[PDB]
Design a protein around this ligand. Structure first.
Ligand SMILES: [Zn+2]
Ligand SMILES: [Zn+2]
Lengths: 49, 258, 99, 59, 66, 149, 28, 179, 446, 59, 100, 115, 179
């Protein structure tokens, strides 16, 4: 429990793929494919904005 | 601030390739024609295959793929058809497509070469290239195997799929002797002479010519059968001139509306 | 290695005669000498191949090893005998023997 | 308590993996072995065992 | 498995040359003199016919019926 | 004006240590009147210079005769009459150093203005009077022209 | 009579005869 | 490749865009020069050089290992009889601007392989799927629709960042929250 | 909602070994199905684009998003605290092309300058004055790379080939071979850029940019270099080939002579020892002084022939251009491809007597010579003899064995260390304590 | 499928290039990997230094 | 930044250097406090940096070698302390995880 | 599965404009034309045609990403000449030249064929 | 023996006659320690300054020390040895026609290539491994260049138009059972 389940869990909102280069992306940008973006989500509060 | 006056000189014209020389033009205009030969020249190619019975040893998509790569003589049709996505019809039209039909059953004992002789068209002018030299083998059937399908040819260009690419190979070249030193040889004599080199067998490259631009671009456009090699050209010039006219119309709308 | 019978020999520098053996130094020289010796060893085996690690990070490791007055190994017998609290020791090793 | 993997599923992925799976030898020495001398190419495997085809994992 | 229709690199139709090329090799032509009697100049197009291995002849041995 | 310098030089040695690059060579000229050294790197491909050639080298601070001191940006469409119209090789650089034989007490007699022309260096090592208008970090032109005598 | 420097053609005839007779999986 | 040079497709250009020689031979595959010098697979270049002779002669080259008859001066002398540079270089043109590339590029036919590790059998994503039964944490495996493992090494790298909220979200709130 | 453009993710290659293996990135979505990432970032991750896979965690709250954005974003992680030098440098194809772009003889005309400026994001719309105005306006390599360099940095580095005896002689501030990089006011004045000045070393130019300007200005620096240089290399081109592995047939003679003198030298050592005249070195047995003399002779042969191979390399060589820029390879890779491969050791010794008193059955009993114990004397261009193919494989198996034991033996050191030190931290007391609040150091790092 | 010619391997839906050498066990092809071991019946004098013994004549 | 021209004689009183470095050694505080125990340790923790600071910002090097003007010297001192104060270890920083 | 359909390189979506002018603010008299669903075929001829205009002080084009089908053309002219009319005149004469090249290729064909 | 052996399969002369006639021998590893083996026959059994002059065996071909996946590398002697090991491993993932009756097998997981080619430069011992009958790969026009930037760290750039024409197109078969 303590090492396989308490110090390291499996998490939701993860992805995994093969990396390939893109010299046209800035150094702090990642290019994600479209299905991986359309799968994982971000809960965003509603505001009059 | 203005245009240039290119001149053309066909050196060889057969029914399979054209060699011409264009003089007095920019390298960008001469290379952008080269790209229009390869992508944007319309041509007819099978693009919709409905397979009714396939019992060959090849797939279902292996047949359809090998059928898209069969070149069909588009020559005066291809400029009368419409693109499929622009025909105001439902389920292909004689005015935007050409219908084909293959029906083969091997009944005899020897194997059957399904070749492109078996593709029967409904227009007499868009046929696979069989007119006047064997035929493109599609499958080989055994005793009892068969293939019935009907297919449709529509208009397109080599920018969507390579199947709509009218050329075997375009051989562009300029400045055969390294007069501009656009390429820099580490040992200039290990290099064979160009075909067009106006140079003796003594000297290796032309002496450096400091103020000078490329002209005299040498082309060698080779057809795959579908269009005639001088129609590939006359159509790439018109296809480029039409991309530019459309851009200009959309530009004048953007300008007047700002 | 003897290091105590050698330092006492004459014509032997009893100032610079070091020992490569941090358990020999500890019983001879002290715990504050083990800290200097341990870091010289640790820096020899790191800069041997030409690379460089900041000094902060070697002082901190040699300080935790020698912070309670004896030589605390970085094994289950060194860091589990430290009084850190059982939920932290059950995460390194032994996991139930300590619980 | 037995040996394991003495009998594996044949690899039909390309003909050259079938053919090499059928001619494969196995030294039974366990893994979690920090020794090297059984993993070194001995002079004496000359002409018997291929000196280039080995797995690059822990085996 | 079966001769490709076009040369992958070039675009040139090589689908109609496998029978002609096996017939010329049966005649007596050497393999380099068969490839240009067919009209294949670029070495891109010439490896389509040299390197091709014809498996459909082996796959046709597995008759479904008769 | 703005003529920081002006003289006649003549190529005394061309790339001496061996040719390190291919379109650039070191010219080790010497002067004729003020008796100065020069170490120049020229684009030996669009302006070839051979030994024993003599050229007039005018290091200027601006190009317009009235000395109106342009900005340092390139604008080709310009009517104003320049000094570059009577020269054949014009460069544009930035003096990056001024060494000298100063001592701790008395001044210096021999200066050396090192200017750098986009990467192509130069050193005008003379005496401390002809090297006056040169101060470090200032934009300067080259303006040389071969004398066919 | 001996075989000299005509030997790469002959080194591979005995290899081909070996592999006709014994396949590759004969040891199984 | 047949020499230990693995690696993935990085982008694909049409034909109008690949660089091309003085006839329209565009490459099929363009590999990087930096793969060669540290790995010292010279056999790759010799094969790319002999494949060009073989496709020009019209018959299949021989690359048996220890062979004394083949070397590179001999292949090079043959290649220059078909009118190529004897070392395999050619003069390519840019496909985008049309201008010659000032270096001569080393082009010729090499036998590539296609390994079974395609990407569309590895791409994998999760956002609140199924859950194990004993410890109600996401399942494992791509086919089970599992979640990736945020193991311990990934937790030390988050302590060192001093990121306590991302750490307790990855280890509590996106894994197995309970009360 | 779905993850969209601009989100913050955290991105991670798997043997997570230091802090710079979980940096955070901004999301940009693209067509095909792979995670695509810039190339300088491959150095911290240790990534490689030959089938590597990286994970991507998505923070799920405003409070975790903001924390990642302020603590782990990628331009915040440029300088490592482990060795106080950048972790990201310019490292392939771009490093090779920048060494060629900043050589002294690179001149560009207005059509290529105006095209390379289109890939500068920090450009202000003013074309600099060309370095050559007549007879034709030409710009320079350095003059365009000065527009990339941000701010007004000042640094001085030395190129890779800088001869050591130049800073003594004359021509110190005007260098014949254009080594000695000098940036002043954020302008390259002199010098050729290589890994010694744009790589990941303490004090390189990408380090000075970080200590001087932000992490944000340095973020645009790394990106502009690769976008201008990768576009010029469509003009210049880079390759490698067979021609780059050949010597010059006088070099082949020089090498064959060195190698034959060396095989001859070891024969006399063998004679001396066979007649009992090789007297032992004081500190070694006989078989160790013998093996030492032999390995000295053979290592000298390899070094001499390798150096005489490099001196023969032209400037247009393509091995040399990836070695001098430091992009890939070393002087010992040129030497083994061109000159000689060298001596194949297993466990530090020469190839051992695996059969009875000989190394293979081809040799004869008690053969200490160079060929009979593993000294490969061909190059990879000539190919290896059959026996030395085998010895080269016996040698090359050691590296594959040690890689596979290394991976598992060091991963356990790092785990024992973190468990022993994880809760030591810097208190607001500014003292370094642990979980029991016992003081470890009174100030961090003293 | 033994000594059987090549038409007949194809009439049974098989390939004549199959090598053989594997078992079908519940419709899986299984291979037996060859295991090495020490030669029997042979005297080997080793020397374990990590014990009380100078030498050891195993057999 | 201030265009020094090390060829002209400078206007930087040799004593403004001596006293500006004295006032800057005060603003680099590591161990805060007026206690003797705390002044001792503030003096120890910044001992090598203070030696370096006092050996490159001499009165003699600043006049025979760097030739700083007065205004450039004020900019310089404000810059040195503003960088030093950024180098201090942040509290909260998990240094044992970095050392490992 | 994440493969974009191949007609996406030339077909305009619904809402996308072909071309889009944006005044640039860093320098006076500079614009940025953003063409959608175009590539180096059309972007290179226009730039090289604009460099023939003597009143054009800067012309260039870039393709920001190759997986995306959009080019940007930045033009800067002299103050008596807007870049709107530089770009227009660079097309009008590029058209006139391609039309003339077509006429000449056509007569050279019909003279080569029996002649 | 060479002539009789060339006329095998026309009558009935074979390898067993070479063994029975006393020409080749099966030597093994404990006996190989007292042979004095020559590597090639002419060249090691000629007359110079003597190396041994008491040879007792001679090797058939030296390249018969390589195994099955290592014997398809062309010029393995020009490669650094770890590269030959990586290809021995990556040659077993190469997709290709894995067997000829593949339409009858109901394997889990089969991959076959549409258009596999024979290598243009082969070794001589990949004849027996029957590799030219069931090949796994395509001879493609590689071009070692560094073009756009996309092929930069073990990455490659493919031709889109080549792929449109069927280049390395493959097919993947998965079988499901149920009773
Ligand atoms: Zn219709
Ligand atoms: Zn072709």
């Amino acid at each position: 429990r303590v090492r396989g389940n308490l110090m390291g869990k499996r998490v939701d909102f993860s992805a995994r793929t093969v990396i390939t280069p893109d010299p046209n992306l800035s150094i702090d940008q990642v290019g994600v494919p479209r299905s991986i973006a359309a799968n994982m989500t971000f809960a965003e509060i509603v505001t009059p904005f | 601030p203005y245009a240039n006056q290119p001149t053309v000189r066909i050196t060889e014209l057969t029914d399979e390739n054209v060699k011409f020389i264009i003089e007095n033009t920019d390298l960008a205009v001469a290379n952008s024609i080269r790209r229009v030969f390869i992508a944007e020249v319309p041509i007819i190619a099978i693009d919709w295959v409905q397979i009714d019975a396939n019992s060959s040893v090849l797939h279902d998509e292996f047949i359809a793929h090998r059928l898209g790569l069969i070149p069909l003589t588009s020559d005066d049709i291809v400029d009368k058809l419409q693109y499929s996505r622009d025909c105001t019809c439902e389920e292909f039209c004689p005015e935007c497509s050409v219908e084909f039909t293959l029906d083969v059953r091997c009944n005899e004992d020897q194997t059957r070469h399904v070749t492109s002789r078996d593709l029967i068209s409904n227009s007499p002018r868009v046929i696979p290239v069989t007119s006047r030299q064997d035929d493109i083998l599609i499958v080989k059937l055994r005793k009892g195997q068969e293939l019935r399908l009907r297919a449709y040819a529509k208009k397109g260009f080599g920018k969507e799929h390579a199947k709509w690419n009218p050329t075997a190979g375009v051989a562009f070249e300029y400045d055969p002797d390294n007069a501009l030193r656009h390429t820099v040889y580490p040992k200039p004599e290990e290099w064979p002479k160009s075909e067009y080199s106006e140079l003796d067998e003594d000297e290796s490259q032309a002496p450096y010519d400091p103020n000078g631009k490329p002209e005299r671009f040498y082309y060698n456009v080779e057809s795959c059968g579908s269009l005639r090699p001088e129609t590939i050209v006359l159509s790439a010039l018109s296809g480029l001139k039409k991309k530019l006219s459309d851009l200009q119309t959309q530009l004048s709308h953007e300008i007047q509306s700002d | 290695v003897s290091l105590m019978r050698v330092l006492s020999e004459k014509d032997v520098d009893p100032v610079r005669t070091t020992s490569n053996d941090i358990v020999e130094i500890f019983t001879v020289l002290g715990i504050e000498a083990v800290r200097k010796a341990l870091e010289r060893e640790l820096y020899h085996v790191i800069s041997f191949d030409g690379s460089y690690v900041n000094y902060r990070h070697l002082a901190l490791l040699c300080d935790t090893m020698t912070c309670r007055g004896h030589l605390m190994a970085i094994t289950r017998h060194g860091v589990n005998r430290q009084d850190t609290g059982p939920l932290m020791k059950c995460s390194f090793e032994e996991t139930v023997d300590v619980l | 308590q037995a040996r394991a993997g003495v009998s594996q599923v044949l690899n039909r992925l390309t003909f050259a993996s079938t053919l090499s799976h059928l001619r494969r030898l196995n030294s039974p020495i366990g893994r979690d072995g920090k020794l090297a001398k059984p993993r070194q190419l001995h002079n004496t495997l000359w002409g018997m065992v291929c000196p280039a085809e080995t797995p690059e994992g822990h085996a | 498995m079966i001769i490709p229709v076009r040369c992958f690199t070039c675009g040139k139709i090589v689908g109609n040359k496998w029978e002609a090329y096996l017939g010329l090799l049966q005649a007596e032509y050497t393999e380099g003199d068969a490839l240009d009697a067919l009209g294949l100049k670029r070495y891109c197009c010439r490896r389509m016919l040299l390197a091709h291995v014809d498996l459909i002849e082996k796959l046709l041995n597995y008759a479904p019926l008769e | 004006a703005g003529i920081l310098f002006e003289d006649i030089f003549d190529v005394k040695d061309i790339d001496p240590e061996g040719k390190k690059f291919d379109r650039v060579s070191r010219l080790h000229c010497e002067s004729e009147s003020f008796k100065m050294d020069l170490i120049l790197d020229v684009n030996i491909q669009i302006y070839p210079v051979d030994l024993g050639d003599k050229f007039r080298l005018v290091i200027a601070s601006t190009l317009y005769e009235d000395g109106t001191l342009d900005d340092g940006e390139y604008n080709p469409t310009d009517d104003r009459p320049s000094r570059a119209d009577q020269f054949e090789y014009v460069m544009y650089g930035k003096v990056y150093r001024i060494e000298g034989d100063e001592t701790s007490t008395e001044a210096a007699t021999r200066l050396s203005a090192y200017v750098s022309y986009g990467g192509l260096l130069m050193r005008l090592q003379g005496d401390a009077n002809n090297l006056h208008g040169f101060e470090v970090d200032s934009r300067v032109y080259l303006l040389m022209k071969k004398l066919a005598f | 009579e001996i075989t000299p420097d005509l030997w790469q053609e002959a080194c591979w005839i005995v290899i081909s005869s070996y592999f006709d007779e014994k396949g590759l999986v004969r040891q199984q | 490749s047949r020499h230990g040079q693995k690696g993935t497709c990085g982008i694909q250009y049409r034909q109008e865009d690949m660089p091309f020689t003085c006839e329209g031979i565009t490459p099929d595959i363009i590999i990087n020069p930096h793969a060669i010098p540290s790995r010292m697979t010279i056999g790759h270049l010799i094969e790319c050089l002999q494949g060009k002779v073989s496709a020009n002669k019209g018959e299949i080259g021989d690359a048996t290992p220890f062979n004394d008859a083949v070397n590179v001066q001999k292949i090079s002398n043959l290649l220059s009889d078909y009118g190529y540079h004897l070392r395999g270089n050619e003069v390519l043109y840019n496909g985008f601007t049309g201008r010659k590339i000032t270096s001569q590029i080393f082009i010729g036919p090499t036998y590539y392989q296609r390994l079974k590790h395609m990407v569309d059998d590895k791409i994998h994503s999760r956002a609140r799927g199924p859950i194990q039964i004993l410890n109600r944490q996401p399942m494992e495996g791509r086919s089970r629709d599992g979640g990736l493992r945020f193991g311990e090494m990934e937790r030390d790298c988050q302590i060192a960042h001093g990121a306590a909220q991302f750490l307790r979200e990855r280890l509590f709130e996106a894994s197995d929250p309970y009360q | 909602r779905h993850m969209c453009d601009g989100d913050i993710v955290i991105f991670n290659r798997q043997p997570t070994l230091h802090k710079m293996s979980m940096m955070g990135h901004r999301v940009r979505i693209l067509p095909w199905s792979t995670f695509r990432l810039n190339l300088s970032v491959t150095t911290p991750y240790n990534a490689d684009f030959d089938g590597d896979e990286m994970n991507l965690h998505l923070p799920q709250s405003l409070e975790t998003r903001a924390e990642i954005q302020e603590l782990a974003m990628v331009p915040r992680m440029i300088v490592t605290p482990q060795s106080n030098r950048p972790v990201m440098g310019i490292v392939q194809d771009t490093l090779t092309a920048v060494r060629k772009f900043t050589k002294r003889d690179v001149f560009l005309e207005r059509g290529e300058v105006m095209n390379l400026l289109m890939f500068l994001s920090t450009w202000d719309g003013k074309v600099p004055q060309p370095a050559i105005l007549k007879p034709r306006p030409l710009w320079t390599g350095k003059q365009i790379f000065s527009l990339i360099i941000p701010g007004h940095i000042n640094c001085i580095r030395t190129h890779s080939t800088h001869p050591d005896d130049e800073d003594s002689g004359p021509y110190k501030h005007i260098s014949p071979g254009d080594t000695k990089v000098v940036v002043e006011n954020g302008e390259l004045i002199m010098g050729i850029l290589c890994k010694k000045s744009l790589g990941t070393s303490a004090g390189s130019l990408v380090h000075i940019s970080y200590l001087e300007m932000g992490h944000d200005i340095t973020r645009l620096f790394y990106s502009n270099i690769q976008t201008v240089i990768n576009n010029w290399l469509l003009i210049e081109g880079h390759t490698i080939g067979i021609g780059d592995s050949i010597a010059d047939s006088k070099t082949y003679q020089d090498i064959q002579n060195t190698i034959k003198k060396a095989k001859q030298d070891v024969i006399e050592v063998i004679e001396k020892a066979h007649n009992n005249e090789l007297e032992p070195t004081p500190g070694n047995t006989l078989r160790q002084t013998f093996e030492n003399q032999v390995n000295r002779i053979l290592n000298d042969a390899r070094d001499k022939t390798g150096s005489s191979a490099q001196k023969s390399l032209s400037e247009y060589n393509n091995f040399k251009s990836m070695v001098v820029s430091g992009a890939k390879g070393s002087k010992i890779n040129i030497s083994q491809v061109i000159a000689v491969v060298g001596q194949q050791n297993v466990e530090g010794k020469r190839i051992p007597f695996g059969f009875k008193h000989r190394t293979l059955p081809h040799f004869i009993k008690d053969d200490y010579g160079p060929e009979s114990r593993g000294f490969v004397e061909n190059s990879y261009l000539a190919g290896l003899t059959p026996t030395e193919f085998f010895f080269h494989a016996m040698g090359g198996r050691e590296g594959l064995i040690d890689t596979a034991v290394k991976t598992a033996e060091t991963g356990y050191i790092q785990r024992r260390l973190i468990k022993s030190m994880e809760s030591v931290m810097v208190k607001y007391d500014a003292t370094v304590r642990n979980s029991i609040n016992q003081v470890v150091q009174l100030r961090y790092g003293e | 499928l033994n000594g059987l010619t090549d038409r007949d391997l194809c009439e049974l839906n098989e390939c004549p290039l199959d090598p053989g050498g594997y078992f079908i066990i519940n419709g899986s092809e299984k291979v037996l990997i060859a295991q090495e071991k020490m030669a029997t019946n042979t005297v080997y004098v080793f020397a374990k230094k990590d014990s009380k013994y100078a030498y050891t004549g195993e057999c | 930044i201030f265009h020094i021209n090390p060829r002209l004689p400078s206007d930087l009183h040799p004593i403004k250097v001596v006293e500006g470095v004295k006032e800057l050694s005060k603003k680099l505080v590591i161990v805060n406090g007026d206690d003797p125990l705390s002044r001792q340790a503030q003096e120890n923790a910044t001992l090598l940096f203070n030696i370096h600071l006092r050996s490159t910002l001499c009165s003699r090097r600043m006049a025979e070698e760097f030739r700083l003007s007065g205004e450039a010297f004020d900019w310089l001192l404000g810059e040195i302390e503003s960088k030093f104060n950024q180098a201090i270890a942040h509290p909260g920083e998990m240094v044992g995880a970095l050392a490992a | 599965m994440n493969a974009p359909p191949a007609f996406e390189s030339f077909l305009l979506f619904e809402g996308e404009k072909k071309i889009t002018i944006n005044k640039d603010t860093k320098v006076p008299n500079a614009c940025l034309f953003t063409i959608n669903k175009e590539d180096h075929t059309l972007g290179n001829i226009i730039k090289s045609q604009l460099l023939k205009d003597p009143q054009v002080l800067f012309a260039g084009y870039k393709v920001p990403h190759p997986l995306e089908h959009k080019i940007i053309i930045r033009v800067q002219t002299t103050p008596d000449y807007s870049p709107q009319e530089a770009f227009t005149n660079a097309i009008t004469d590029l058209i006139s030249e391609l039309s003339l090249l077509e006429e000449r290729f056509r007569v050279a064909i019909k003279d080569k064929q029996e002649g | 023996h060479i002539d009789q052996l060339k006329e095998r399969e026309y009558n009935n002369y074979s390898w067993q006659d070479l063994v029975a006639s006393g020409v080749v021998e099966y030597i093994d590893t404990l006996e190989e320690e007292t042979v004095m083996l020559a590597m090639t026959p002419d060249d090691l059994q000629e007359k110079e300054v003597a190396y041994c002059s008491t040879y007792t065996h001679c090797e058939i071909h030296p390249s018969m020390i390589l195994g099955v996946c290592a014997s398809i590398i062309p010029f393995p002697d020009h490669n650094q040895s770890p590269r030959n090991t990586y290809q021995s491993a990556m040659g077993k993932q190469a997709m290709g026609v894995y067997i000829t009756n593949f339409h009858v097998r109901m394997d889990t997981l089969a991959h076959v290539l549409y258009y596999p080619q024979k290598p243009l430069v082969t070794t001589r011992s990949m004849e027996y491994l029957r590799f030219r009958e069931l090949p796994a790969g395509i001879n493609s026009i590689v071009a070692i260049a560094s073009y756009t930037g996309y092929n930069q760290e073990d990455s490659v750039i493919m031709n889109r138009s080549a792929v449109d024409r069927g280049f390395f197109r493959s097919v993947f078969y998965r079988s499901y059972k149920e009773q």
